Amino acid sequence: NSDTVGWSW
Amino acid sequence: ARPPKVQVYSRHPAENGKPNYLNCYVSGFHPPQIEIDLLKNGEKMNAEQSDLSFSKDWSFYLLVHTEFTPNAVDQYSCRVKHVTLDKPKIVKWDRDH
Amino acid sequence: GPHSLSYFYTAVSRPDRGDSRFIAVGYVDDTQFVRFDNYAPNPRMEPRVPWIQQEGQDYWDEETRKVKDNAQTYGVGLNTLRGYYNQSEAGSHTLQSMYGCYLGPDGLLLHGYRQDAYDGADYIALNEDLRSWTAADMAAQITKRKWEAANVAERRRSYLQGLCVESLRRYLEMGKDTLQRAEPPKTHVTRHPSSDLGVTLRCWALGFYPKEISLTWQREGQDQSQDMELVETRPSGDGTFQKWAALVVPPGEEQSYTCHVQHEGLQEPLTLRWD
């Protein structure tokens, strides 16, 4: 299952 | 930009007239744009390409592969084109290497 | 030794035309199981081994959702990093990530990671404690302060400790017959008389899984391993791997040289010679 990657660099 | 390293080899030890798989492994390159073609006597073979992935050092690797039954006269080779090479890299398949 | 689940994200910018290609690959140890590509029309998370098709459409819809969203996060992030490095919008650039978990004796997380690279170079990494970041350069300090202040570490940690290892256990059950079997090398040595008198001995290892292997050549008088011509470990095309190591030896002295093969699929280390 994927991680949820949502925060800007 | 790092150039690709290219290997051409069979899945099993080559036996003339007996079906096998021809593989063209391309790795260690950056950026990811690349042209990899399996050639049977200079003509592109229909081959599937793996999904783009990378090593721990971020360099990319791809596997181009199709079936083949080698003999004593057919010449197999892998042609690669990348920004790091101004002239294409052709490596010819060798049953011993 | 311990099993792992990992994802590999590659985002590439398009010169002066605002889109970005997003490619994602899923691995359970050394076996690719899923894929996603947003060049395809109506991109979806698609299976690339038989066993993961155990998962019904609910799974595929949800995962498709999450990698589409992740994909636009990486588009924005590409434009951001291009901001930090004061680069033009005329060149294409690359943002890569890899993250994953290793399952420990507990049924819990042994260790886990998340690393980010820009244009093939280290950018930022999560540390072993899963509570702090390592910035590879000046720009990654900008990202680092941002991620500390927002506690992004706890998002990646709760994923690694929760969903990641639970899914890893399920995937290991589903593909029990393929993912849990370590397959040892089939080995043999070939002989190529070739340099007027120098003979080439080549030690092959084919058909093994997982990836990591060791091949070395030894000569009877010397304690250090010999200089050899070694190929990078390469895929067989069917899920196994292969490698060889060779060296040139004087004619008539082949029985002085031994090939040593180490692989966790073998009971004990393997010695092999040109017989």
Summarize the structure.
It is classed as structural protein. With 9 residues, chain A is mostly loops. Chain A is 0% helix and 0% strand.
General description of the model:
- It is classed as structural protein.
- The entry lists the keywords MHC class I structure, A single-amino acid mutation, Peptide motifs, Random peptide library, structural protein.
- The assembly is trimeric.
- The entry is titled "Crystal structure of pSLA-1*1301(F99Y) complex with S-OIV-derived epitope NSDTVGWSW".
- Chain A is peptide.
- The complex is a heterotrimer of chains A (9), B (97) and C (275).
- Chain A has 9 residues and is largely without helices or strands.
- Helix content of chain A is 0%, strand content 0%.
- Chain A contains no helices and no strands.
- Chain A is rod-shaped, with a radius of gyration of 8 Å.
- Chain B is mainly beta.
- Chain B has one domain (1-97).
- Chain B has no helices and nine strands.
- Chain B has strands spanning 5-10, 20-29, 35-40, 43-44, 48-49, 53-54, 60-68, 76-81, 89-92.
- In chain B, strands 1, 2, 5, 6 and 7 form a five-stranded antiparallel beta sheet that branches. A four-stranded antiparallel beta sheet of chain B has the order 4-3-8-9, with no helix packed on it.
- In chain C, strand 15 (257-262) and strand 16 (270-272) form a beta hairpin.
- Chain C folds into two domains: 1-181, no CATH class; 182-272, no CATH class.
- The two termini of chain C are 33 Å apart.
- In chain C, the strands form three sheets. Chain C has an eight-stranded antiparallel beta sheet. In chain C, strands 9, 10, 12, 13 and 14 form a five-stranded antiparallel beta sheet that branches.
- Chain C is an alpha+beta fold.
- Chain C is globular.
- Chain C has helices at residues 57-84, 138-149, 152-174, 176-179; strands at residues 4-13, 20-28, 31-37, 46-47, 94-103, 109-118, 121-126, 133-135, 186-195, 198-208, 214-219, 229-230, 234-235, 241-249, 257-262, 270-272.
- Classes of the chains: A little secondary structure (9), B mainly beta (97), C alpha+beta (275).
- Chains in contact: A-C, B-C.
- At the B-C interface, strand 1, strand 2, strand 6 and strand 7 of B face strand 1, strand 2, strand 3, strand 5 and strand 13 of C.
